[PDB]
Amino acid sequence: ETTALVCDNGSGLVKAGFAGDDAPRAVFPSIVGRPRHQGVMVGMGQKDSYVGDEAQSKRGILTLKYPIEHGIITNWDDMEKIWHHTFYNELRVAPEEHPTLLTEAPLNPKANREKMTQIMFETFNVPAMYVAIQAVLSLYASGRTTGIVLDSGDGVTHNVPIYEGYALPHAIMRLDLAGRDLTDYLMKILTERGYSFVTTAEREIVRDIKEKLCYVALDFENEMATAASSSSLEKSYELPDGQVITIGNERFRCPETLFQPSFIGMESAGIHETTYNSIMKCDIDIRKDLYANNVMSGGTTMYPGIADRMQKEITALAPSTMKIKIIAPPERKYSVWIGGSILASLSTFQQMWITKQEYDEAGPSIVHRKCF
């Protein structure tokens, strides 16, 4: 028949696929590279600009830039390029054939939803579409109707509490810290050890270090005293050309900043405190069930130990008599897509798609009343 397209724009990875299957069948960075040098060789197949895995491969000669920054879309032409590449090159499926489901972070400018709909209907002619909160889909993915979600990709971190399938708007917390802007810190602490990564290609090389070798200390202070006293924590990594670099306390010290955003000079406290101060805004009758389920989602929650650091300090903040349980399946990096894949395959959801009939009647204003 016809099956929804399910897409998560994120920052960094785009991941897309058809609803009703287990995992996305395109994943690639949301990155657009334009070449900046003078090309000398003639008759080369040289091209206006590259997208996704192409620009990753050629990146030595490119300025990479990201069209999404803290879940806001900041460029529209590059964003059109990325969606165009997703549907035609990655899925090899026309948009006209399929309704589309799109993912978003909460509390961000309504112009973003307006534009994203206006594009999907006008340029693609997608027959119907819907725009959905990431945190909501993480619960579908994890099999629960109740919980507090912590979801962090690049850019935006946010908590949404959910109780028996009611949202709780006043308790939503959003935080710009996660994921991209760890790396900008990690570049600086590596500069302290006498390595300097300046260009955007070097930023991608740092990001690969961060993915490989960082981990979260159960107690930050004991582990700094240990690595100060010893080499035993120290690991070495091979840069693309074949130099080797050796990194010490910097590896645990980078993801500590999620717990102490004062390291980058943000005001707000770390994810443990905003999670707790979210639970504190819920009515007392549900807090036992929120404390009993915490779902962690998205790549920034992948670092080894982050769940067990979290449980330890929430258990310190929370009253003493209760289970704190942190639920963090190994799959969690894809949970937002998996939950979108469940959601778009439901029958009840077939009545909720915005359809072109209504957009043509109402203009893009409709998205606010029809969608969340």
């Binding site: 920054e69 803290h70 806001i72 900041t74 400018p109 710009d176």
Partner: peptide
């Protein structure tokens, strides 16, 4: 963004 943050 438009005011506070850079985007």
């Amino acid at each position: 963004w438009x005011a506070x943050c850079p985007a």
